[PDB]
Every structure is written in C-alpha cells, then in structure tokens.
Amino acid sequence: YSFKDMPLXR
Amino acid sequence: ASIAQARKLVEQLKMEANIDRIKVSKAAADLMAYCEAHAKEDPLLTPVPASENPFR
Amino acid sequence: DVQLVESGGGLVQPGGSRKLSCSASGFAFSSFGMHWVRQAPEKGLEWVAYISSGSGTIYYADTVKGRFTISRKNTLFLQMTSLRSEDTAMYYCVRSIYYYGSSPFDFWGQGTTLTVSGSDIVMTQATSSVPVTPGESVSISCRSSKSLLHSNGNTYLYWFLQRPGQSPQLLIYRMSNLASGVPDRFSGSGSGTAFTLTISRLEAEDVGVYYCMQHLEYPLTFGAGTKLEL
Amino acid sequence: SAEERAALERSKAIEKNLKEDGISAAKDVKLLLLGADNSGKSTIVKQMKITGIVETHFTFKNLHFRLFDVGGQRSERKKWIHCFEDVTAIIFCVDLSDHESLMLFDSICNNKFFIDTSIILFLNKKDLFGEKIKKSPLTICFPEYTGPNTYEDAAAYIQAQFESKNRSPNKEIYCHMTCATDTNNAQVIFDAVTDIIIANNLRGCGLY
Amino acid sequence: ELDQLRQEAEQLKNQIRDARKACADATLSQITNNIDPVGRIQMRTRRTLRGHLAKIYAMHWGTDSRLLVSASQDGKLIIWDSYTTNKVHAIPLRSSWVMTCAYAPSGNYVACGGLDNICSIYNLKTREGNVRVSRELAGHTGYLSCCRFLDDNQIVTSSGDTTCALWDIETGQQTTTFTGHTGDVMSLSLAPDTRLFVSGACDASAKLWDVREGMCRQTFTGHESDINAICFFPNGNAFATGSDDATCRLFDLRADQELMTYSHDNIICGITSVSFSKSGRLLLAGYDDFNCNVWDALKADRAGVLAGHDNRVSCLGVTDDGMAVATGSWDSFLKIWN
Amino acid sequence: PLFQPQDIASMVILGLTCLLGLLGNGLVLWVAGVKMKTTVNTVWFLHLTLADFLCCLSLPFSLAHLILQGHWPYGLFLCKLIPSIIILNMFASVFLLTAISLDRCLIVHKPIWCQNHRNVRTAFAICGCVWVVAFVMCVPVFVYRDLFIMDICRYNFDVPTPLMAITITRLVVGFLVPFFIMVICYSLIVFRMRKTNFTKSRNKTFRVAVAVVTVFFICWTPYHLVGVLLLITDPESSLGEAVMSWDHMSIALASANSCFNPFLYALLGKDFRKKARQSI
C-alpha cells in the first residue's frame, strides 16, 4: 500500500 | 596685435634650433647598454622566488 | 597644543571605591587609544589597563583584572572598586595610535596621586644607577625573556625618559626609530633579547630615569629602570 | 600580531565609515547643467536659491537635487565630460532670443557616455522670442522655414528641430517653455526626475 | 611684417627638420635586433584593494615602496598598505571631481586636484592625529591635470589652460610659470634628478622644460592625436608618451627625435597611462580596451597582457624597487600585480 | 511491473529538470557573483537563484530514492535533515518570488520612497526576514523526520490532527497568500502602466507578468491539489489510488519550477544578458 512512501517533497 | 606672438615664436624656434645633436646610433647604444647593465636588478622580467617576494 | 589633565585621586580607606577621570583636549580623542600606567611612590612603572578606539578591545593586567573597569565627550574613565593597600601609586594617562609608521605612547598625562591606607615577558635592567659626567657618552642596557622581533621584522622595545619631578616622555619607539621633538643625540639598537640605548654629548636635560618597555604581548611589562644621576 | 590587531580594527572601522558614507550619499540625485553662453543657466540656478565647477544643492519635496554647473570650464569638453557619466539627467538650456546651440545639443545627445541619460530641455525668454517674432520673422535664424509668422508655430518648429537630433530609442527628451517669471521650474524638474527614476529602476529590474 | 615673421619661422622649422633628419644614422630597431627578446612576462594578481565605491583616476606609489594613495570620484583619498591590504588613512575631499594625486617623497604630504582648479596639500604627520589641509594652491584657470612633488616644499602642476606652474607650498604663490603649449596639458613627469621635466599636451606635441631657468629647450612632435601620459626613462635621458591614437612612442633627448613606435593593428582604444620598469626594459601602458599591455622597450614586441579589469584602466605605476605593479581602473578596484 | 509509467515519467522529467536547473543556476550564480557587484536590483536574483540551485542539488536525492522502493540506506540524521533542506529551499524560492513581485510594485507605485529609503541593506534585511520565515515554516519537518520504522523515512505521527495542521498551513502560506499577492502586485503594475508614461514598456511588462503568473500556477497548483486530495476520504477508493499514482508527477512538476525560474527571472535584463553572453 505504501506506494509513494512519503516522497522527498512532502 | 599678433606681431608679438610671431616674434616670440620666431625667437623660441631660433633658441631651440641651436641645441647640439648626437647621432641616433650613440643614443640607441646608450639606452641598450643601460638596459643591459641593470637587468639583474629588475624583478619584473624575471620571476622572483617566493622567499624574496613580499607579496606572495 | 595637546594636553591630558586628569583628577580623581586622594585618600581612600581599604575596601572603598573611586573613579579617576582623564580629560583630553587639543587632539582627536575619538581616534586615539588610551592606556593607564601607574607608578609606586618609590618603585618603577607598571601597566594597568588599556582601551582601544571605539571601545572595541579592552585589556587588564593579571593583578588588577576584575577589580577595575576602563570606560570612555573627550574624557577617559577608570572605574575602581575594592581598593587595597597595594594600589597606592601615581596614575598617568597615556595616549597611543596604532597604524603603519605610527608612534604609540607619544604623549603622557600629568598624573594623579592616590593613597590607600606566568606568561609575562620579564624585562630586567641590571644597572640600577650610572654616574656620568656631562659631555660624556653613556649607555643603558635592557634584557628580555623572549625574542621581541616578530616575523614582520619590527622589534617592539620602547624607551622612555623620566626627568626628576616630571612625567615620562617618549624617546625611542620600536628600538630603532627616533620620536619627534627629541634631539638626534639619542640612539638605540638591539638584537632579539638584549637592547641598548646610547647618548652622545650628554647635557643637563638628559638627567633622569630611563625605562625599558616591551609591546609584543599584553600585559605590557615595564623595567626596573636606570637612574642616570649627575 | 601585537599592534597589527589595532591596525586591523582601525582598517575595519574606516571601511565601515566608507560604506556608511557611500550609502548616505547614494540618496542624492545628480543633475548636469549645460547650454550656450548667457543662455539662462544663471537665471534658473538663482531662481532655486542656494572659475571652476559650480555646485548647487537644494531639497524639493523629499528629493536632494545636486546641480553641477560647469559653464566656467573654458577648456576642451571631451577631456572632462566623462566625469558626469552617472548623472540622472542633463538639464539643457537654450536662449530663444538668439543656431550655435544646435551643434552643442547634437554633440551632447549622441555622445557615447550619454546614450541612456535623458535630457531636460528648458526654453527661456519666451516673451523676448515673441518680441523678436513681432519685430522680425523667424526665418532669419532658420532660412529653411516656410510657414506663417507667429509665436506658436515658431515655438513648435524650434521644438521639432531640437528634438529631431535624438537617435537612441532608449532615451527621452522632456521640454518646457519658461517665461523667466514663473516658479514652475522646480515642479517640471521634479516630475521629470521621478519618471526618470521609475524608468531607470524598471530597466535595472529588466521589466522595462 | 607678419608675413616676414611667418617666413622666418618656416625657414627655422625647415632648418631644424633638416638637422634632425641629418643625424638619423640608423633606427633603434636595426641596433637592438641582435639581442635576445624578453620572452613571456606572465604576471598574476597578488592583492586587491576593495575600498572605493566609484571611478578611480589616480594612484601614486610611496617612496618606501609599501604605501599607495588612490584618489576616486567618491570624494575620498584613502592611503593603502599594499603588503597587508590595510587602509591606513581616509582623507575626505572638498571637491569630489579629482583627476590627479601625488605622494610626497618624504611621505609627509599628499596632494590632490581636479576640476576645482585648486591643488590641495594635505599633512599626514599632524601632532593632533587627524589629517588636515595645509595649503590650498590657487591661480590656474583650466582644470589641474597632474602634480608632482619636487621636494618637501616645491610642487609642479600641469593644468588644462596651456600652462605648467611651479609653486612654493610655504608661501602659496606661482614662483615660475611655463607657457608655449597650444592645447590642454594633460600629463607631467619629473626627471629623477629633479632638475628637468616634460609635459604632454593635447596639441600632439611634447616639450621639455627647465625648473630653474623656466624656459623650454626642445619640442617633440610626431603624434597624431592628444597626448595622455608621459614618463621619463630611468636613465633620465629619454621619455615615452602615450597618445589617443592607440600607439606609444619613444623620444631621445640628445637625439631630439622619436625612436620607436609601439603600435599593433589589433588594438584600437586610446592609451590612458604609461610607466617603465626599474631597469627601463619593459614599458607598461594602460589602454582603454580594459587591458594593460607589456611592451619590450628595445624591440617593440608584446610580452604579456595584464587582463582582469572590468573597465578601462586609468592609472598605472611601478614601485621604486620594481617589486610590484599597481593598476587603477574605473571599476573601483586597484590591483597589485607581480 | 516495478516501474509504473507515471513513475518513469516522473524520474525522467526530474532528471532533465535537475540537469537544466543545475546548469542555469550555476551560470547565473557565477556571473552575478563574479562579473557584477551586488546592487539593489540584483540581490533578489542572487537569493532566488541560490535557493533554486540548492533545490536542484538536492533533487538527485529524490532521484535515488524513487528507484526500487526507497528503503533509504543512508542513515538517520540525513533522514531528519534532507527533506527539511528541500522544503526550506523550495519555499524560500516561492517567498523570494513574492518578495520580488512586491518590490516591483513598490518601485512602480512609490518612486520617492524607493529613491530615498531603499538600498542594498534594506533588501538584504527583507531577504533575511523571508529566509527566517521559511526556516520557521520548515521546523516541523525537521522535528518530525526520522527513521521511525526502519525494518523508510516515515513522517513522525506521535487522520491525525498534526497532519491536517501542517498540510493546511503549507497550503495556505505557500499557495493562497503568495499567489494572491503576486497577482495583485502585477495587476496593479499593469493598471498603473496603462497610462501614457509607459508607452515603450506596457507590452513587455504585460507579457512578463502573464508569463510568470501562468508558469507559477501551472507548476504549483498540482502539488497542493494532490496534497489536499489524498487527505480526504478513505484511500481504499479509486480516487485515493489515482492521487497516490499522480503524486510523483505532481512533485516532479513542483520541482520543475526550480529550473524554470532562472530563465524567466535572471535572464531578462539586457545588461545581464550581455554579461552572460560574454562569460560563456
């Protein structure tokens, strides 16, 4: 489910 | 009016045309000899070592 | 001309406080650093405190640190707290400006008398007194514990003369240069640790006590002095 | 490093003084006076109050103007004109009672050092120009004029000739007619200088 | 009678021209052709004095080869310490339009001048501590363009009103004035013996003067535009003048004629300043093309470029010992080259 | 497949914008810091291009993170520092854009005040102020970034209300206030320049204003749009999956403003253009 994995952006 | 200026110019040229002149060869030789004699004392045309250089 | 008159001394019981004020006139006080040199009633000189131009840097001697305070309207102050029996002396006001070719310690104040009821560069003057006849050449010698010649090539040995009953006057600065207003008969030299000053054609105006001072590092340690009595 | 530290602090203190003085002096606006002999420069510099160069400084509505009259330098202009390369505007004066000023205007407007600096043109002695027009046609000074003889058309013709000497599209010429008895000179200078400041700042930002 | 005077002047000019052309046994190039060239002179910037905020027009070295003074358009004359890039003095000016400066050989005085027609003398060793003007020399009509210190008292100034002047700072009066130039005089140099001096004017003619007698001896011509700089040879028997025709020329005092022309088809901008070296072998000239060229004096060959300035260089001068070269420019930065 | 097509599109666009922004920001910083001095009208460009250069330099970290899954095998302190640095430089860039717009409005509308009271020192002071504002805004990511799970730089959650608070404050302070101030300032500049004073400048000013506003909008709207879209409703729905899928492209577009800025801002003046041409 953790696809974006908290992108470095946000 | 301008006669005084003409007279002054004539007198100045007469005075300045009486200077003794030497051949250009002698003057060129003198300048070359002076440049050659003081070559060792000129730190611009030879790279000064960093020890002697105060701006290093 | 220049003048540094001052007042504020007197009799203080131990544990009290006082405030010595130095009044300066006749020169640009705002661009001149100010020092403070005292002298015991029988001993030699001793540095006390120093304030720079604009109150940027302040220094104190090891034996006075914390007790005193130096502050600068053309007036110099010396806040003084917890006076003890060892602080009795005559205090002088000294000006000094530092730049290339400058002459520090050039002028000295009249002075005020106050009565109370490890890393230092040690400078010693072995000859306590020298009897000399007028018209005869004399010499004064000074020593040091460290080399005073910095890397830039300037030695920092200063020579002063104290006439009997008068304020000290600058004679030679940086161990080789001659101060303005002093006759050319005076001359000085040295090498690293040993320094000497020579006088030729001595006259009655040369009678006094000569002091050897360094300026390489604070505190500014003075010498014991040499008395060139007649 | 005993007394070298005092040298360093002195150098830093005087450097700070230099920076503060430069910041304080950057506020003032600089103007350069020019014109023919007895063209009316003295009249306008004296109407605002306050042998070599003559400096006049006045403040008007929160602006510090600095006029540099240089009419007293009776030497070659080319060898000292570049000293005023940073002036905000060039105040040019022409006497309408007098041809000789056209060459000066052409030389000063197309100079390499003033390609981006505007020129404020003042025309003086309007009453004298009208009196001359009544006495004599304006064709004596300008033999190529072909038209009626009155104040308005002659003034417009002189304005057109003085403005046609411009060649750079990045500069503007502000013009005004003075009757030698009016106090509008300060207002005209203020209104021109504010626009010039706006244009200069916009061009510096690149938005222009 | 005017026609007779003009004819006499023309005859005298013809006679002097014939005499000068009769003594040209050979050119300087044919004599110094057999000597080895100087080579490549690659000089790198050593210091940079970032103190000024406007254009710089003057920079004169001290007699001790350590202190330098620069006059800028910010109305400030700040004495520099080249060894450590320390500012030692900052003298405000009454007239910010200054285009020349000088530093006294004794070091006690500094002179400056410009569009105010006044040569101001400043004292640096005042007992009060600050720097105050000691004398204000006035009497020129045209703008002052150059001033040099003969000694601690006298001073020679070249103005823009076709006159060179000799002053006495003690009395503030024109002791001797020199006339004969037709156009503005824009440069001046004093001989090493402080007995002769020359002036480069805007009428494309260089003249030699006498400080004592006060009369001209020789007149040198050959330039096509105004002369902007001048400097004696270290031997004192020659000088070089840089004009606005992008060329330098070398004049021999005893030969009384030009010797060499330092021209290059590439360069087109005018010359702002000239100066020799300690041995007189290298001639450094400051062009308006934002770069300083090094000219081998005896062979007229370029030896290197002292590029690095963002605007035109306005002044250049070597130290007395020759250990450094200072270049002042319009970009407010004076750089010490070596 | 391991590489979702949106993921590879994001990776390639991020690499291209990183290269272009690095080149442009390096050139601009070098020329404006060496060739010319720091005048009143150049410090804004200096700070904007510095923030954009920092963003472009930190972007390759995002490139490396989105490769396999983003296990972040770098350490702990970097996990608490790098996201903070990235957000700090990005919001410094946006606040500097707003400050530039405000300065242009002040220049156009108040000439006497700018002439008499505005200089380099005031510009540096206000730039320091906006830098401090960015740092204060980016404190929370610094204090909440850590290798919490570590078995993954999970944003610490000690939907939780801290997440709502941070996302709302970011959305407001980074989209509503700055964009509205920029639009108002440029509209006022155009309105004032509608007069006959700015005949030779109205067209260029209008073009520049429309260009900068539309570039900022197109670059920064999807960022906050997906930031608020993924927050609402259960992500089990198809909308949540869609917003998660497009978050990569959204952040890539948001980062692309870093390379877009120097061309639109630094390379506008004729003198700066000539200096750049000479330096190259």
Side-chain angles (χ1 to χ4, degrees), chain D residues 106-115 117-118 120-125 127-133 136-137 139-151 153-156:
Chain D
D106 174 337
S107 180
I108 193 66
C109 199
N110 304 319
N111 189 358
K112 65 179 73 174
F113 300 121
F114 303 135
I115 56 183
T117 61
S118 62
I120 303 164
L121 190 78
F122 281 163
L123 299 197
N124 296 115
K125 280 73 176 175
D127 46 352
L128 263 63
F129 184 42
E131 290 181 341
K132 174 183 141 163
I133 278 162
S136 162
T139 187
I140 303 294
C141 187
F142 284 104
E144 69 275 16
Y145 184 110
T146 61
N149 186 11
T150 187
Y151 166 80
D153 62 356

Coordinates of all heavy atoms in Angstrom, one line a residue, chain D residues 106-156, unseen atoms left out:
Chain D
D106 N 23.5 68.5 -30.5 CA 23.8 67.3 -31.3 C 25.0 66.5 -30.7 O 24.9 65.3 -30.5 CB 24.0 67.7 -32.7 CG 24.5 66.5 -33.6 OD1 25.0 65.5 -33.2 OD2 24.3 66.6 -34.9
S107 N 26.0 67.3 -30.3 CA 27.2 66.7 -29.7 C 26.9 66.0 -28.4 O 27.4 64.9 -28.1 CB 28.3 67.7 -29.6 OG 29.5 67.1 -29.0
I108 N 26.1 66.6 -27.6 CA 25.8 66.1 -26.2 C 24.8 65.0 -26.2 O 24.9 64.1 -25.3 CB 25.4 67.2 -25.3 CG1 25.5 66.8 -23.8 CG2 24.0 67.7 -25.6 CD1 26.9 66.4 -23.4
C109 N 23.9 65.0 -27.1 CA 22.8 64.0 -27.1 C 23.3 62.6 -27.7 O 22.7 61.6 -27.3 CB 21.6 64.5 -27.9 SG 20.0 63.6 -27.5
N110 N 24.2 62.7 -28.6 CA 24.7 61.5 -29.3 C 26.0 61.0 -28.7 O 26.6 60.1 -29.3 CB 24.8 61.7 -30.8 CG 23.5 62.2 -31.4 OD1 22.4 61.7 -31.1 ND2 23.6 63.1 -32.3
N111 N 26.5 61.6 -27.6 CA 27.8 61.2 -27.1 C 27.7 59.8 -26.5 O 26.6 59.3 -26.0 CB 28.2 62.2 -26.0 CG 29.6 61.9 -25.5 OD1 30.3 61.0 -25.9 ND2 30.1 62.8 -24.5
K112 N 28.8 59.1 -26.5 CA 28.8 57.7 -26.1 C 28.5 57.5 -24.7 O 28.0 56.5 -24.2 CB 30.2 57.0 -26.5 CG 31.4 57.6 -25.7 CD 32.7 56.9 -26.1 CE 33.1 57.3 -27.5 NZ 34.5 56.8 -27.8
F113 N 28.9 58.5 -23.8 CA 28.7 58.4 -22.4 C 27.2 58.7 -22.0 O 26.9 58.4 -20.8 CB 29.6 59.3 -21.7 CG 31.1 59.0 -21.9 CD1 31.9 60.0 -22.5 CD2 31.6 57.8 -21.6 CE1 33.2 59.7 -22.7 CE2 32.9 57.5 -21.9 CZ 33.8 58.5 -22.4
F114 N 26.4 59.3 -22.8 CA 25.1 59.7 -22.5 C 24.1 59.1 -23.4 O 23.1 59.8 -23.9 CB 25.0 61.3 -22.6 CG 26.0 62.0 -21.7 CD1 26.7 63.1 -22.1 CD2 26.2 61.5 -20.4 CE1 27.6 63.7 -21.3 CE2 27.1 62.1 -19.5 CZ 27.8 63.2 -20.0
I115 N 24.3 57.8 -23.8 CA 23.3 57.1 -24.6 C 22.0 56.7 -23.9 O 21.0 56.6 -24.5 CB 24.0 55.9 -25.3 CG1 24.5 55.0 -24.2 CG2 25.0 56.3 -26.3 CD1 25.2 53.8 -24.7
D116 N 22.1 56.6 -22.6 CA 21.0 56.2 -21.7 C 20.5 57.3 -20.8 O 19.6 57.0 -20.0 CB 21.3 54.9 -21.0
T117 N 21.1 58.4 -20.8 CA 20.7 59.5 -19.9 C 19.8 60.5 -20.6 O 20.2 60.9 -21.7 CB 21.9 60.2 -19.3 OG1 22.7 60.8 -20.3 CG2 22.8 59.2 -18.5
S118 N 18.7 60.9 -20.0 CA 17.8 61.8 -20.7 C 18.3 63.2 -20.7 O 19.3 63.5 -20.0 CB 16.4 61.7 -20.0 OG 16.5 62.2 -18.6
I119 N 17.6 64.1 -21.4 CA 17.9 65.5 -21.5 C 16.7 66.3 -21.2 O 15.6 66.1 -21.9 CB 18.5 65.9 -22.8
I120 N 16.7 67.1 -20.2 CA 15.6 68.0 -19.9 C 15.9 69.4 -20.6 O 16.9 70.0 -20.2 CB 15.4 68.2 -18.4 CG1 15.1 66.8 -17.7 CG2 14.2 69.1 -18.1 CD1 15.3 66.8 -16.2
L121 N 15.0 69.8 -21.5 CA 15.3 71.0 -22.3 C 14.4 72.1 -21.8 O 13.2 72.0 -21.7 CB 14.9 70.7 -23.8 CG 15.4 71.8 -24.8 CD1 16.9 71.7 -25.0 CD2 14.6 71.7 -26.1
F122 N 15.1 73.2 -21.4 CA 14.4 74.4 -21.0 C 14.6 75.5 -22.0 O 15.7 75.8 -22.4 CB 15.0 74.9 -19.6 CG 14.4 74.2 -18.5 CD1 15.1 74.3 -17.2 CD2 13.3 73.4 -18.5 CE1 14.6 73.6 -16.1 CE2 12.8 72.7 -17.5 CZ 13.5 72.8 -16.2
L123 N 13.5 76.1 -22.5 CA 13.5 77.2 -23.4 C 13.1 78.5 -22.6 O 12.0 78.6 -22.0 CB 12.5 77.0 -24.6 CG 12.8 75.8 -25.4 CD1 12.1 75.9 -26.8 CD2 14.3 75.6 -25.7
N124 N 14.0 79.5 -22.6 CA 13.9 80.7 -21.8 C 13.6 81.9 -22.7 O 13.7 81.8 -23.9 CB 15.2 80.9 -21.0 CG 15.4 79.8 -20.0 OD1 16.4 79.1 -20.1 ND2 14.6 79.6 -19.0
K125 N 13.1 82.9 -22.0 CA 12.8 84.2 -22.6 C 11.8 84.1 -23.7 O 12.0 84.5 -24.9 CB 14.1 84.9 -23.2 CG 15.0 85.6 -22.2 CD 15.7 84.6 -21.3 CE 16.7 85.3 -20.3 NZ 17.3 84.4 -19.3
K126 N 10.7 83.5 -23.4 CA 9.6 83.3 -24.3 C 9.0 84.7 -24.7 O 8.7 84.9 -25.9 CB 8.5 82.4 -23.7
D127 N 8.9 85.6 -23.8 CA 8.5 86.9 -24.2 C 9.4 87.6 -25.1 O 9.0 88.3 -26.1 CB 8.3 87.8 -22.9 CG 9.5 87.6 -21.9 OD1 10.4 86.8 -22.2 OD2 9.5 88.4 -20.9
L128 N 10.7 87.4 -24.9 CA 11.7 88.0 -25.8 C 11.6 87.4 -27.2 O 11.8 88.0 -28.2 CB 13.1 87.8 -25.3 CG 13.7 89.0 -24.5 CD1 12.9 89.4 -23.3 CD2 15.2 88.8 -24.1
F129 N 11.4 86.1 -27.2 CA 11.2 85.4 -28.5 C 9.9 85.9 -29.3 O 10.0 86.1 -30.5 CB 11.1 83.9 -28.3 CG 11.0 83.1 -29.6 CD1 11.8 83.4 -30.7 CD2 10.1 82.0 -29.7 CE1 11.7 82.7 -31.8 CE2 10.0 81.3 -30.9 CZ 10.8 81.6 -31.9
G130 N 8.9 86.1 -28.5 CA 7.7 86.7 -29.1 C 7.9 88.1 -29.6 O 7.4 88.5 -30.7
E131 N 8.7 88.9 -28.9 CA 9.0 90.3 -29.3 C 9.8 90.3 -30.6 O 9.6 91.0 -31.5 CB 9.7 91.0 -28.2 CG 8.9 91.4 -27.0 CD 9.6 92.1 -25.9 OE1 10.9 92.1 -25.9 OE2 9.0 92.8 -25.1
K132 N 10.8 89.3 -30.7 CA 11.6 89.2 -31.9 C 10.8 88.8 -33.0 O 10.9 89.2 -34.2 CB 12.8 88.2 -31.6 CG 13.6 87.9 -32.9 CD 14.7 86.9 -32.7 CE 14.8 85.9 -33.8 NZ 16.1 85.2 -33.8
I133 N 9.8 87.8 -32.8 CA 8.9 87.4 -33.8 C 8.1 88.5 -34.4 O 8.0 88.7 -35.6 CB 8.0 86.2 -33.3 CG1 8.7 84.9 -33.3 CG2 6.7 86.2 -34.1 CD1 8.1 83.9 -32.4
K134 N 7.6 89.4 -33.5 CA 6.8 90.5 -33.9 C 7.7 91.5 -34.7 O 7.3 92.0 -35.8 CB 6.2 91.2 -32.7
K135 N 8.9 91.7 -34.3 CA 9.9 92.6 -35.0 C 10.4 92.0 -36.3 O 10.4 92.7 -37.3 CB 11.0 93.0 -34.1
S136 N 10.8 90.7 -36.3 CA 11.4 90.1 -37.4 C 10.8 88.6 -37.5 O 10.5 88.0 -36.5 CB 12.9 90.0 -37.3 OG 13.5 89.1 -38.2
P137 N 10.7 88.1 -38.8 CA 10.3 86.7 -38.9 C 11.4 85.8 -38.4 O 12.6 86.1 -38.4 CB 10.1 86.6 -40.4 CG 11.0 87.7 -41.0 CD 10.9 88.8 -40.1
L138 N 10.9 84.6 -38.0 CA 11.9 83.6 -37.5 C 12.7 82.9 -38.6 O 13.4 82.0 -38.3 CB 11.1 82.5 -36.7
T139 N 12.6 83.4 -39.8 CA 13.3 82.8 -40.9 C 14.8 83.3 -41.0 O 15.6 82.8 -41.7 CB 12.7 83.1 -42.3 OG1 13.3 82.4 -43.3 CG2 12.7 84.6 -42.6
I140 N 15.1 84.4 -40.2 CA 16.5 84.9 -40.2 C 17.4 83.8 -39.5 O 18.5 83.5 -40.1 CB 16.6 86.2 -39.5 CG1 15.6 87.2 -40.1 CG2 18.0 86.7 -39.4 CD1 16.1 87.6 -41.6
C141 N 17.0 83.3 -38.4 CA 17.8 82.3 -37.7 C 17.7 80.9 -38.5 O 18.7 80.2 -38.6 CB 17.3 82.1 -36.3 SG 18.3 81.0 -35.3
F142 N 16.5 80.6 -39.0 CA 16.3 79.4 -39.8 C 15.8 79.7 -41.2 O 14.6 80.0 -41.4 CB 15.2 78.5 -39.1 CG 15.8 77.8 -37.9 CD1 15.5 78.2 -36.6 CD2 16.6 76.7 -38.0 CE1 15.9 77.6 -35.5 CE2 17.1 76.0 -36.9 CZ 16.7 76.5 -35.6
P143 N 16.8 79.8 -42.2 CA 16.4 80.2 -43.5 C 15.5 79.2 -44.2 O 14.9 79.5 -45.3 CB 17.8 80.3 -44.2 CG 18.7 79.4 -43.5 CD 18.2 79.5 -42.0
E144 N 15.4 78.0 -43.7 CA 14.6 76.9 -44.4 C 13.1 76.9 -43.9 O 12.4 76.0 -44.3 CB 15.2 75.6 -44.2 CG 15.2 75.0 -42.8 CD 16.4 75.6 -41.9 OE1 17.0 76.5 -42.4 OE2 16.6 75.0 -40.9
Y145 N 12.7 77.8 -43.0 CA 11.4 77.9 -42.5 C 10.4 78.4 -43.6 O 10.7 79.4 -44.2 CB 11.3 78.7 -41.2 CG 9.9 78.8 -40.6 CD1 9.7 78.1 -39.3 CD2 8.9 79.4 -41.1 CE1 8.5 78.2 -38.7 CE2 7.6 79.5 -40.5 CZ 7.5 78.8 -39.3 OH 6.2 78.9 -38.7
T146 N 9.4 77.7 -43.8 CA 8.3 78.0 -44.8 C 7.0 77.9 -44.1 O 6.4 76.8 -44.1 CB 8.4 77.2 -46.1 OG1 8.2 75.8 -45.7 CG2 9.8 77.4 -46.7
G147 N 6.4 79.0 -43.6 CA 5.2 79.0 -42.9 C 4.8 80.3 -42.4 O 5.5 81.3 -42.6
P148 N 3.7 80.4 -41.6 CA 3.2 81.6 -41.0 C 4.2 82.1 -40.0 O 5.2 81.5 -39.6 CB 1.9 81.3 -40.4 CG 1.9 79.8 -40.3 CD 2.8 79.3 -41.3
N149 N 4.0 83.4 -39.5 CA 4.9 84.1 -38.6 C 4.1 84.4 -37.3 O 3.3 85.4 -37.3 CB 5.5 85.3 -39.2 CG 6.5 86.0 -38.3 OD1 6.9 85.4 -37.3 ND2 6.9 87.2 -38.7
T150 N 4.2 83.5 -36.3 CA 3.6 83.8 -35.0 C 4.4 83.0 -34.0 O 5.4 82.4 -34.3 CB 2.1 83.4 -35.0 OG1 1.5 83.8 -33.8 CG2 1.9 81.9 -35.2
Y151 N 3.9 83.1 -32.7 CA 4.7 82.5 -31.6 C 4.5 81.0 -31.6 O 5.5 80.3 -31.4 CB 4.2 83.1 -30.3 CG 4.6 82.4 -29.1 CD1 5.9 82.5 -28.5 CD2 3.8 81.5 -28.4 CE1 6.3 81.8 -27.4 CE2 4.2 80.8 -27.3 CZ 5.5 81.0 -26.8 OH 5.9 80.3 -25.7
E152 N 3.3 80.5 -31.8 CA 3.1 79.1 -31.5 C 3.8 78.2 -32.6 O 4.5 77.3 -32.2 CB 1.5 78.8 -31.6
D153 N 3.6 78.5 -33.8 CA 4.2 77.7 -34.9 C 5.8 77.8 -34.8 O 6.4 76.8 -35.0 CB 3.7 78.1 -36.2 CG 4.0 79.5 -36.6 OD1 4.6 80.3 -35.8 OD2 3.7 79.9 -37.8
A154 N 6.3 79.0 -34.6 CA 7.8 79.1 -34.4 C 8.3 78.3 -33.3 O 9.3 77.6 -33.4 CB 8.1 80.6 -34.3
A155 N 7.6 78.4 -32.1 CA 8.0 77.6 -31.0 C 7.9 76.1 -31.3 O 8.9 75.3 -30.9 CB 7.1 77.9 -29.8
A156 N 6.9 75.6 -32.0 CA 6.8 74.2 -32.3 C 7.9 73.8 -33.3 O 8.4 72.7 -33.2 CB 5.4 73.9 -32.9

